[PDB]
Amino acid sequence: MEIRVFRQEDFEEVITLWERCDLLRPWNDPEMDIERKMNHDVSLFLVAEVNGDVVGTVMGGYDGHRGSAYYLGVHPEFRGRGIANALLNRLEKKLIARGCPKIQINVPEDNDMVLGMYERLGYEHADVLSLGKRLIEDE
């Protein structure tokens, strides 16, 4: 099992993996989200490869004050093997390697399995409200 940075050749496999992980949302064009990362900085956008195939990903990121993580997914047939953990742990190390002091992640207030996963990894709930404003609309 090997964790590495996303490459242009992984483009379609990654999207298909997102489809299978139910990570796609109508308001976020996945082609656009990948192109944004490619143009901005691909280095924290990781994939997990097992026997040559991409079976997991995490779109990590850093803005100069806090790290982030979106599109965390592991293919259904490859779950319960510690891949998401491996992914998150590698991101955290890449983040620390460049001076990132903290990582923040937003999770659906509904998903308990994911909430639990983050808690076991040492993440704690922040007493804040998350607000947002769309700047460029996707289709």
The verdict on 103 binding its own copies (CB under 8 A) reads: yes
Q: Contact region for its own copies (CB under 8 A) — 10-18, 40-48, 50-58, 75-83?
A: 40-48
CA–CA gap between residue 13 and residue 11 (Å, rounded): 6
Q: Smallest distance, Å, CB 57 to ligand ACO?
A: 9
Residues 10, 45, 48, 75: which binds its own copies (CB under 8 A)? 45
Centre a 10 Å sphere on the Cβ of residue 55 and count the other Cβ atoms it contains: 21
Question: Is the CB of residue 67 less than 8 Å from the CB of residue 59?
Answer: no
Structure tokens at 6: 């996303």
Task: Tell me the CB-side half-sphere exposure of residue 36, using CA atoms within 13 A.
Answer: 11
Burial of residue 26, with CB atoms counted within 10 A of its CB: 0-12 exposed, 13-18 middle, 19 or more buried: exposed
Contacts with ligand ACO in 70-89 (CB under 6 A)? 70-74, 79-85
The smaller minimum CB distance to its own copies, of residues 56 and 60, is found at 60
Contacts with ligand ACO in 93-132 (CB under 6 A)? 105, 107, 113-114, 117, 120
Residues 30, 56, 61, 73: which binds its own copies (CB under 8 A)? 61
| CA distances in angstroms from 13 to 53, 62, 109, listed in the order given | 9, 24, 29
Q: Which residues bind its own copies (CB under 8 A)?
A: 32-33, 36-37, 39-41, 44-45, 59, 61-68, 70, 92, 95-96, 98-109, 115, 118-119, 121-138
